[PDB]
Amino acid sequence: EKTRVLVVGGTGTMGRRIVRACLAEGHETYVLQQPETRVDIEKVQLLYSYKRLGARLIEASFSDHQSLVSAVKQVDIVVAAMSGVSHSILVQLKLVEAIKEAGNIKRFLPSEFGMDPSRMGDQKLEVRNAIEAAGIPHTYVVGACFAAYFAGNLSQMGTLIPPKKKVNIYGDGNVKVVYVDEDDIAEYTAKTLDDPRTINKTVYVRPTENVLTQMELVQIWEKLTGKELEKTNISANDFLADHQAGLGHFYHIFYEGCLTDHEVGDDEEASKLYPDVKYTRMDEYLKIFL
Amino acid sequence: EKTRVLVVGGTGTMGRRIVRACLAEGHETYVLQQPETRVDIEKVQLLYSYKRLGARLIEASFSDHQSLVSAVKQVDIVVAAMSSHSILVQLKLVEAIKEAGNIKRFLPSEFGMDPSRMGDQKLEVRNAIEAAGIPHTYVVGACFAAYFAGNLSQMGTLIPPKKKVNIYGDGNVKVVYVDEDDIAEYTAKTLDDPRTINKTVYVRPTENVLTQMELVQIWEKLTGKELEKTNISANDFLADHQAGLGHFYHIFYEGCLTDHEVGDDEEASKLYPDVKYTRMDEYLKIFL
Numbered sequence: 001e002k003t004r005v006l007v008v009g010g011t012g013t014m015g016r017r018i019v020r021a022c023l024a025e026g027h028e029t030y031v032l033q034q035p036e037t038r039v040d041i042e043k044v045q046l047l048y049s050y051k052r053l054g055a056r057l058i059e060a061s062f063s064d065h066q067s068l069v070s071a072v073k074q075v076d077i078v079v080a081a082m083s084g085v086s087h088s089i090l091v092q093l094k095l096v097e098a099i100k101e102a103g104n105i106k107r108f109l110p111s112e113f114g115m116d117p118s119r120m121g122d123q124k125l126e127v128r129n130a131i132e133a134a135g136i137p138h139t140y141v142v143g144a145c146f147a148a149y150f151a152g153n154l155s156q157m158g159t160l161i162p163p164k165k166k167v168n169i170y171g172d173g174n175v176k177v178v179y180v181d182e183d184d185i186a187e188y189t190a191k192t193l194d195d196p197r198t199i200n201k202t203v204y205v206r207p208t209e210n211v212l213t214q215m216e217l218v219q220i221w222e223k224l225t226g227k228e229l230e231k232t233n234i235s236a237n238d239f240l241a242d243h244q245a246g247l248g249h250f251y252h253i254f255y256e257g258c259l260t261d262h263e264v265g266d267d268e269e270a271s272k273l274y275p276d277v278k279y280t281r282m283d284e285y286l287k288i289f290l
Numbered sequence: 291e292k293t294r295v296l297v298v299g300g301t302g303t304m305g306r307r308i309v310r311a312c313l314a315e316g317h318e319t320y321v322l323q324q325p326e327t328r329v330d331i332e333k334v335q336l337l338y339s340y341k342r343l344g345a346r347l348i349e350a351s352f353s354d355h356q357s358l359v360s361a362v363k364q365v366d367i368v369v370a371a372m373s374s375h376s377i378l379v380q381l382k383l384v385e386a387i388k389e390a391g392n393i394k395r396f397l398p399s400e401f402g403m404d405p406s407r408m409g410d411q412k413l414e415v416r417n418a419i420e421a422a423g424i425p426h427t428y429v430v431g432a433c434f435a436a437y438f439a440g441n442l443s444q445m446g447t448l449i450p451p452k453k454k455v456n457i458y459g460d461g462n463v464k465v466v467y468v469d470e471d472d473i474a475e476y477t478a479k480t481l482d483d484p485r486t487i488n489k490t491v492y493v494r495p496t497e498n499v500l501t502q503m504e505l506v507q508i509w510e511k512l513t514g515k516e517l518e519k520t521n522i523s524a525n526d527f528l529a530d531h532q533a534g535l536g537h538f539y540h541i542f543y544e545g546c547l548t549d550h551e552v553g554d555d556e557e558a559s560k561l562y563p564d565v566k567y568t569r570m571d572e573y574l575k576i577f578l
């Protein structure tokens with residue numbers, strides 16, 4: 001009676017949530033167990049902790065193409081969530097080749113969860129374009145910044161915890177960004193992967209109240225701690241260099257506004273499509289850091 | 291009404307289990323939040339998943355003395371849990387405890403083969419704790435079950451094999467297999483227990499004292515199949531760098547984890563009959 005899902009990349013940051021949210025939804029959840037890459041003990045107990053919650057384990061190497069055929073034949077829906085910081089993401093081309101040979105897949109949701117690649121501001125679109133080629137029903141989940149990577153640090157780089165003294169502001173901090181608890185991404189991805197309204201579509205994850213400028217997120221923190229931070233404005237060029245952990249990414253989100261420039265309809269916005277998901281406002285999210 | 295435990299090494303394999311268990315027991319538990327080595331999602335969240343249970347974080351750096359000092363001044367008992375360079379940063383911690391001296395006990399990092407037996411730098415650390423007047427307890431004696439049970443004492447894997455197996459000697463040496471969670475709960479109980487202050491607490495739960503052959507056969511019975519077994523003897527087992535293979539020797543050929551027994555007054559499973567530890571028959575049902 002269920003939609004059996006296979007979560008590729010089930011032990012990663014975004015992946016492990018999706019496993020969990022799938023199960024919560026009520027899904028016969030499936031995770032891919034890959035030919036071990038060393039003595040990695042976080043990854044192994046993470047893996048086996050899923051079968052206590054209901055999940056099953058499938059064996060597959062990306063080197064072994066028919067292993068991936070065996071994997072995808074046992075499931076109704078694949079969702080991927082592999083590294084993308086990019087030859088990691090392109091492993092998804094092999095997964096597509098196997099899903100195409102199998103043909104029992106009802107929908108395939110690749111690794112997106114963020115900056116729409118279809119615009120101009122990676123090799124994700126390369127992956128979109130293979131899915132559509134083989135004609136695999138799909139759903140693109142895009143449009144949010146990860147709360148752990150962008151809100152908790154007040155968008156500051158090289159760190160993941162609130163600053164205590166001084167905060168860099170890109171531009172005026174009046175570009176509007178979309179900060180979202182990765183837990184809610186997964187829930188949307190889990191509610192959306194079998195919805196009839198979002199098949200073959202792009203799903204935008206723009207919870208309204210978490211549409212915020214930087215300096216507004218910074219005034220959510222300052223109002224929490226009760227201390228004004230020492231703010232330093234940074235203009236475009238003074239931000240352009242010619243390297244550091246992804247700057248071409250920041251710049252488009254925080255200077256160009258590529259995430260909030262085009263508005264979107266209720267028929268394609270996670271919070272509107274799934275109003276029962278009481279997602280998390282950054283005034284609650286930042287609370288763990290006080 | 292309760293001691294304050296300050297876990298050190300709180301997001302390491304043993305530490306997170308110790309943090310959870312200190313809270314489970316009911317200690318006002320504190321973790322030591324160390325300046326970012328990196329942008330580490332799984333270190334940062336792990337630390338912040340503790341607060342949500344009741345644990346407090348404390349920022350202190352080992353390149354800073356009164357930092358360590360200030361945090362120890364805040365707790366009754368400190369329990370470190372490090373990874374090797376990593377073991378000898380506990381001296382810097384020993385100088386703060388000593389300089390603070392509000393400390394009632396300090397369980398160093400052990401949880402493995404007791405190094406007292408000759409056959410490390412934990413001894414180095416023991417001699418320091420001791421030469422400083424620190425009450426202590428040395429949790430010692432346990433083979434970690436995730437590192438030696440789920441793989442069935444095979445190397446390079448952490449999950450059962452399917453057909454072939456590798457036996458060390460006659461497979462009739464006894465090794466103390468233990469699931470890490472019981473060590474930690476044993477650790478949570480001992481740290482304020484008058485009866486273990488300034489002792490070495492041993493963790494050899496009777497029913498989990500087994501031999502590889504007895505472990506391979508606990509599984510063999512779980513699957514309903516038998517495993518093509520290959521026996522390796524001493525001389526063939528000694529190479530001329532592969533992941534401390536002196537540990538697998540002393541433990542599986544020399545028997546060092548067992549060649550002596552321990553008064554029940556020093557054995558965790560006797561001091562703590564309430565801990566219903568897990569038998570390797572249960573710990574192994576998860577890989578089925």
Ligand SMILES: NC(=O)C1=CN([C@@H]2O[C@H](COP(=O)(O)OP(=O)(O)OC[C@H]3O[C@@H](n4cnc5c(N)ncnc54)[C@H](OP(=O)(O)O)[C@@H]3O)[C@@H](O)[C@H]2O)C=CC1
Nearest residue numbers: 009010011012013014082083084085111112113114145146
């Ligand atoms: N602000 C935002 O929106 C953010 C968006 N993203 C994107 O979200 C999506 C999720 O990615 P993310 O969680 O960050 O990735 P991670 O780096 O956290 O990797 C997590 C999982 O990806 C798989 N993985 C990594 N490397 C390999 C490899 N060589 N071969 C096979 N599998 C590999 C593994 O899954 P397994 O072991 O099961 O095979 C791994 O456990 C991506 O598209 C990513 O680019 C990334 C950063 C922030």
Ligand SMILES: NC(=O)C1=CN([C@@H]2O[C@H](COP(=O)(O)OP(=O)(O)OC[C@H]3O[C@@H](n4cnc5c(N)ncnc54)[C@H](OP(=O)(O)O)[C@@H]3O)[C@@H](O)[C@H]2O)C=CC1
Nearest residue numbers: 299300301302303304371372373399400401402432433434
């Ligand atoms: N078979 C057995 O019985 C085994 C015994 N052991 C023993 O268990 C104890 C805990 O080790 P374990 O948890 O398994 O493995 P880990 O080495 O993975 O512990 C990791 C944690 O130790 C801290 N750490 C790592 N490097 C440093 C460093 N230079 N300086 C300060 N802290 C550091 C960090 O804590 P944080 O960042 O939170 O401050 C890190 O999160 C050890 O003493 C070990 O001897 C471990 C292996 C097997």
Ligand SMILES: COc1cc(C[C@@H](CO)[C@H](CO)Cc2ccc(O)c(OC)c2)ccc1O
Nearest residue numbers: 085114115144145149157158159245246249
């Ligand atoms: C919005 O969507 C996406 C966002 C990203 C963000 C990546 C960019 O490489 C990294 C994290 O992996 C963000 C980061 C970089 C450096 C930092 O110092 C930093 O502080 C924590 C955070 C990748 C893909 C996306 O589709």
Ligand SMILES: COc1cc(C[C@@H](CO)[C@H](CO)Cc2ccc(O)c(OC)c2)ccc1O
Nearest residue numbers: 039401402403432433437445446533534537
């Ligand atoms: C039981 O006593 C102890 C045991 C240990 C285990 C250490 C030895 O270096 C290593 C990791 O550090 C574990 C390991 C070794 C080889 C392997 O093939 C292996 O694969 C799972 C894992 C340390 C301290 C102890 O007191």
